[PDB]
C-alpha cells in the first residue's frame, strides 16, 4: 500500500489511502461494546488473549494519561483537563478514541495503525502513533465508533513482538 505521508502537528502521522482491507489483513473481530478499542489493542499484545485483557489495556492508557498529557499536543482539542478526562475514559463499557491509542503508543513504545474505514471494509485514510512499518506494528480498524484488530494476511501470529 502506497502511503502518503503528513507528520502533524498533534503530534502523529497522516496520511490518505485507497484500501481493501481484506486484501492486507484479516479482520480479527472484537466484541461489539464500549471497550473494543481496548480489546483490539490488547489482540495486538497478547497472543492468549482473553476476554478481559482488554482491562490490561484500559489499567496501561490510565497511567500513560497521567504520565504524559502535558506533552502530548493532542490533548489540547479535548476541551479537558486531566482529571476530567480520566473521569470519562474510566468509565466502565466508554468509548476509547485515537487519543488513548496515543497514550498507550507511548507507554507501551509500540507503534500502531488506525486505518478508518468509510465504506464496507474499505478505508479511504490512516493515522499511524509511531515510526514503524506497517507489518511490525498494531494495526486497527476504526468503524464508526466501533474498533477490531487487523492481523497481516500472511501471518501466523496475531499479535506483534
Ligand atoms: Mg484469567
Known amino acids: ?3 502518503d505521508w503528513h507528520l502533524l502537528l498533534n503530534g502523529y502521522y497522516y496520511s490518505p489511502v485507497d484500501l481493501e482491507v481484506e486484501d492486507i489483513f484479516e479482520i480479527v473481530n472484537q466484541p461489539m461494546d464500549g471497550n473494543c478499542l481496548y480489546h483490539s489493542l490488547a489482540c495486538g499484545m497478547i497472543e492468549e488473549q482473553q476476554p478481559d485483557s482488554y482491562k490490561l489495556i484500559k489499567e496501561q492508557v490510565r497511567e500513560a494519561a497521567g504520565l504524559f498529557w502535558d506533552t502530548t499536543e493532542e490533548t489540547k482539542t479535548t476541551g479537558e ?23 498507550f503508543s507511548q507507554k507501551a513504545k509500540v507503534t500502531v495503525y488506525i486505518w478508518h474505514e468509510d465504506a464496507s471494509k474499505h478505508c479511504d485514510y490512516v493515522v499511524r502513533y509511531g515510526e514503524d512499518p506497517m507489518l511490525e506494528s498494531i494495526n486497527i480498524m476504526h468503524r464508526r465508533n466501533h474498533y477490531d484488530y487487523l492481523k ?5 501470529r496475531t499479535a506483534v513482538v
Do not use: C, H, T
Open 152 to 156: 497481516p494476511r500472511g501471518n501466523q
Open 81 to 103: 483537563d486531566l482529571n476530567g478526562y480520566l473521569a470519562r475514559i474510566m468509565k466502565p463499557n466508554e468509548w476509547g478514541s485515537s487519543l488513548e491509542v496515543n497514550f
Open 1 to 3: 500500500v502506497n502511503f
